[PDB]
Design a protein around this ligand. Sequence first.
Ligand SMILES: *[C@@H]1O[C@H](CO)[C@@H](O[C@@H]2O[C@H](CO)[C@@H](O[C@@H]3O[C@H](CO)[C@@H](O)[C@H](O[C@H]4O[C@H](CO)[C@@H](O)[C@H](O)[C@@H]4O)[C@@H]3O)[C@H](O)[C@H]2NC(C)=O)[C@H](O)[C@H]1NC(C)=O
Ligand SMILES: *[C@@H]1O[C@H](CO)[C@@H](O[C@@H]2O[C@H](CO)[C@@H](O[C@@H]3O[C@H](CO)[C@@H](O)[C@H](O)[C@@H]3O)[C@H](O)[C@H]2NC(C)=O)[C@H](O)[C@H]1NC(C)=O
Ligand SMILES: *[C@@H]1O[C@H](CO[C@@H]2O[C@@H](C)[C@@H](O)[C@@H](O)[C@@H]2O)[C@@H](O[C@@H]2O[C@H](CO)[C@@H](O)[C@H](O)[C@H]2NC(C)=O)[C@H](O)[C@H]1NC(C)=O
Ligand SMILES: *[C@@H]1O[C@H](CO[C@@H]2O[C@@H](C)[C@@H](O)[C@@H](O)[C@@H]2O)[C@@H](O[C@@H]2O[C@H](CO)[C@@H](O)[C@H](O)[C@H]2NC(C)=O)[C@H](O)[C@H]1NC(C)=O
Ligand SMILES: *[C@@H]1O[C@H](CO)[C@@H](O[C@@H]2O[C@H](CO)[C@@H](O)[C@H](O)[C@H]2NC(C)=O)[C@H](O)[C@H]1NC(C)=O
Ligand SMILES: CC(=O)N[C@@H](CS)C(=O)O
Ligand SMILES: CC(=O)N[C@@H](CS)C(=O)O
Ligand SMILES: [Cl-]
Ligand SMILES: [Cl-]
Length: 847
Amino acid sequence: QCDVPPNSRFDCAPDKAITQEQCEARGCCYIPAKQGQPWCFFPPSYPSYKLENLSSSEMGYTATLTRTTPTFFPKDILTLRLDVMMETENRLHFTIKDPANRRYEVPLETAPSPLYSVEFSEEPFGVIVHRQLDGRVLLNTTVAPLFFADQFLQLSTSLPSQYITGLAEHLSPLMLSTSWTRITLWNRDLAPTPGANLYGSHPFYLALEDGGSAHGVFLLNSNAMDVVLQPSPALSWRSTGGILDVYIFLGPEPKSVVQQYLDVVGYPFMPPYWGLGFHLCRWGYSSTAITRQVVENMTRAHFPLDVQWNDLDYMDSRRDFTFNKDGFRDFPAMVQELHQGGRRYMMIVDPAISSSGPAGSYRPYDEGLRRGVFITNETGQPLIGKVWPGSTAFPDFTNPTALAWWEDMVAEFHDQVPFDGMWIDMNEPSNFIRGSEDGCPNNELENPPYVPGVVGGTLQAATICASSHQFLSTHYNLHNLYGLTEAIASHRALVKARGTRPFVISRSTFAGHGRYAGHWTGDVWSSWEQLASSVPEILQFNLLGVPLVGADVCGFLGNTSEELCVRWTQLGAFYPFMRNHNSLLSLPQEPYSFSEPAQQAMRKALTLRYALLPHLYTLFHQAHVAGETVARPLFLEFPKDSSTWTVDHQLLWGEALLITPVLQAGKAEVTGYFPLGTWYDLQTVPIEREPAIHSEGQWVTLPAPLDTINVHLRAGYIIPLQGPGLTTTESRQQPMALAVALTKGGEARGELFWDDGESLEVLERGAYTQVIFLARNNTIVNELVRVTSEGAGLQLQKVTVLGVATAPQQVLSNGVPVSNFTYSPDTKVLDICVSLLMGEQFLVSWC
Ligand SMILES: *[C@@H]1O[C@H](CO)[C@@H](O[C@@H]2O[C@H](CO)[C@@H](O[C@@H]3O[C@H](CO)[C@@H](O)[C@H](O[C@H]4O[C@H](CO)[C@@H](O)[C@H](O)[C@@H]4O)[C@@H]3O)[C@H](O)[C@H]2NC(C)=O)[C@H](O)[C@H]1NC(C)=O
Ligand SMILES: *[C@@H]1O[C@H](CO)[C@@H](O[C@@H]2O[C@H](CO)[C@@H](O[C@@H]3O[C@H](CO)[C@@H](O)[C@H](O)[C@@H]3O)[C@H](O)[C@H]2NC(C)=O)[C@H](O)[C@H]1NC(C)=O
Ligand SMILES: *[C@@H]1O[C@H](CO[C@@H]2O[C@@H](C)[C@@H](O)[C@@H](O)[C@@H]2O)[C@@H](O[C@@H]2O[C@H](CO)[C@@H](O)[C@H](O)[C@H]2NC(C)=O)[C@H](O)[C@H]1NC(C)=O
Ligand SMILES: *[C@@H]1O[C@H](CO[C@@H]2O[C@@H](C)[C@@H](O)[C@@H](O)[C@@H]2O)[C@@H](O[C@@H]2O[C@H](CO)[C@@H](O)[C@H](O)[C@H]2NC(C)=O)[C@H](O)[C@H]1NC(C)=O
Ligand SMILES: *[C@@H]1O[C@H](CO)[C@@H](O[C@@H]2O[C@H](CO)[C@@H](O)[C@H](O)[C@H]2NC(C)=O)[C@H](O)[C@H]1NC(C)=O
Ligand SMILES: CC(=O)N[C@@H](CS)C(=O)O
Ligand SMILES: CC(=O)N[C@@H](CS)C(=O)O
Ligand SMILES: [Cl-]
Ligand SMILES: [Cl-]
């Protein structure tokens, strides 16, 4: 009965240190490890639930689950209801609930055969999900008991392989370790470090299968939870409340798994085009005069900058919706001037509202109080904590009245200072004291029977009381949604205030966040280690449907070095969200603050990003319309090549651009993985060392001096580019170009999506142009999928073709010889000057 292999032992003492006698008294097996692995574990006979009265309907199945022997947790729910819904060919959904009592549930809006089959074990109860095509077992919950107590749910499964990704937010390789790893989801203000619950929680994983297929599992539960991985391999979800509400996504391709997950939680929002430009911020731009010098200094040194930011500096006494009349007396004029020059403006907004001012002196608090917008305590008064301005109350973003109040405060402030988006910080919610100024009461929510592995060992640490009251439920159930709910409220507030697409960047997140907002990875150190760790983290958030993500370029905490900031700017120019931000006590790190050689390398990185913006924007359109990733790991694009599975220090933009950064000090080369095919060096395309890597699926060492980042373009792909500007207001007016990467057989395909860059409801109203580009048999053409006023007058003036094996004697554009072209026999590049329009059918040819 106790003859269970070490790797397959499921912990029967997750709640406390246990002796052999207590372990055995629980009905469990005691076998010490020989050197983590639990010593006390469940035998196969440990009491679980029994399935009874299984029945079928058009939707799927229903059954009763009954537990006869209590567990060691209090308040087992002995009778449960199972509902299995076979929702689509790719999506299976099941719930386990208490039929006698409504329990907390997360607020979320909703040959021919499915890819899955589902079977059940009777006693002990289990759900078993097979992939139909190959019979692989994807889910099998029979592997361990089902626990379902009021404040402890546990469901386990075998995993199909040792390769699993997801379960943000943590500082970790992209592929998670199955070596007895406890992953804790409890939103927490902590500078990113390994082994810790960070700012967000995403209870989703994607599991790879031998041969390159994959599936995903989403547990729709927002309670504090641990997810425990062991090397058998297997996983246990361990939550402190709510219900088991489980979605399984069948793929089979990893890209399809992500799309299927996003079909449930929401496709990524479409950012405004300007949001893809460079953003620059620090804590410490302490006046409008200083802030203005930033733009002046960037401009003088020819560095693009679309958006100027401020941190708390602008506020009056660190309070939302105010500005001080010392250094920021002329804040409105500063922002108006930014707009006059074609730039946008962003500033920090905190959730917590100063509660200490004289009554009637601070409208956000006075109005919030009147309307009852705040989270309240046991006696019904606002819970008061401590954040930047001192004593503060916390808005309840599940309360409709709070949503209306937030809209009003944002609109009123925007009437004074016309900011263009909101940077929402401190929204875990972060509290500088434990729980509240008045502590927290002693009850089961504050002192639960199972506390997940949170930093500080309590759910109150660095946040507010768990038993505090919100409109929908207690904070205990809603905590992991705090940031998400603020992001939703802010998205709506910005739509109403400005009437164009919102731009919200949030610290705290939950599953589905990307439908409303972007993310940055928080208070990272200026270290080579954190530069490297930013790659898997940005990739992870893309898999989780938050493609608008980045880290603070050059790092936030501490002092950066010139070398680190060159490499971080190079890599960071490929973050889908690119912002350099810096702490109050740090040395300056704006691009213009470095030596001339470093400035040149930083300028090159920004210039290349700006040239790529039409392509990056098209990638965001694909994310928004089809649930695609923007920055993606090699394994998403080449899953059948298992050498890609562990690669997380390279990234792709979409299908075709492979970026291989230097991520260590003192390196003048880098070794990266190249999937089978021809990869052209993007440096062979003119913008205002072998030319091609011919890979069989192999590691390649590349030169990478300080001034260089390696970027390669996949053969078979065409990328749209646009001319330069210090802002997108300027760059969007420039002529465009194509880079055409030919296969050996002369083929390539690409596309361009173009709209006005900021309007709402573009796809619904059809207010966009969409063009496909095709290379074949020594010709390049466009195909006009949709042409509207938005895309009219887009000038195509340059076409660069990579992999042209022999010099052409003539090059034609719509049947007439071009004004000129160049061919380089060494690089195999044909560069062609043309006078064409993206929105009018053309034919370019050569021979
Ligand atoms: C729910 O939240 C509300 C706030 O919205 C919170 O109100 C706070 O209650 C405490 C008392 O529990 C108040 O503190 C008092 O303040 C007065 C005047 O400033 C003092 O005179 C009081 O002193 C007493 O306690 C001292 C102990 O150190 C004794 O030495 C002294 O002799 C007095 O007996 C005391 O500090 C606080 O002012 C309010 N806060 C606000 C903003 O009004 C309430 O407690 C919360 N409820 C729960 C159950 O947590
Ligand atoms: C899903 O997981 C469950 C639980 O791990 C698997 O069921 C278990 O399978 C093992 C191995 O087949 C069974 O043990 C074997 O039992 C036979 C007969 O008693 C014995 O001759 C062998 O020596 C061995 O011990 C075990 O009984 C069984 N447990 C239960 C509760 O059924 C199951 O195989 C997995 N399902 C799938 C489809 O993979
Ligand atoms: C499993 O179901 C049986 C039968 O339930 C009946 O048929 C169902 C389709 C539905 O229409 C029910 O409303 C019916 O009662 C349950 O056995 C019955 O239990 C009731 C109450 O205890 C008793 O009056 C009947 O005599 C029982 N009928 C039979 C045929 O045994 C049984 O309790 C269910 N099991 C569980 C764990 O819920
Ligand atoms: C980051 O650096 C600051 C400032 O460093 C100084 O100025 C630079 C130009 C360079 O010349 C450094 O070598 C200098 O030390 C640090 O702040 C200083 O800290 C020291 C030591 O604690 C203190 O004596 C100084 O007064 C501080 N000066 C200022 C202007 O703040 C800061 O400590 C560094 N941060 C970290 C994490 O190391
Ligand atoms: C913008 O650039 C100006 C000029 O380079 C900076 O002003 C100089 O700052 C240095 C400190 O390194 C001082 O020693 C000089 O006295 C300043 N020169 C002038 C002409 O003012 C300025 O600090 C930069 N501002 C920002 C916000 O980066
Ligand atoms: C076009 C321009 O110069 N300014 C615009 C975009 S910043 C504006 O006033 O909002
Ligand atoms: C941590 C890791 O796997 N790689 C690091 C150091 S080896 C890097 O890319 O620089
Ligand atoms: Cl012991
Ligand atoms: Cl509830």
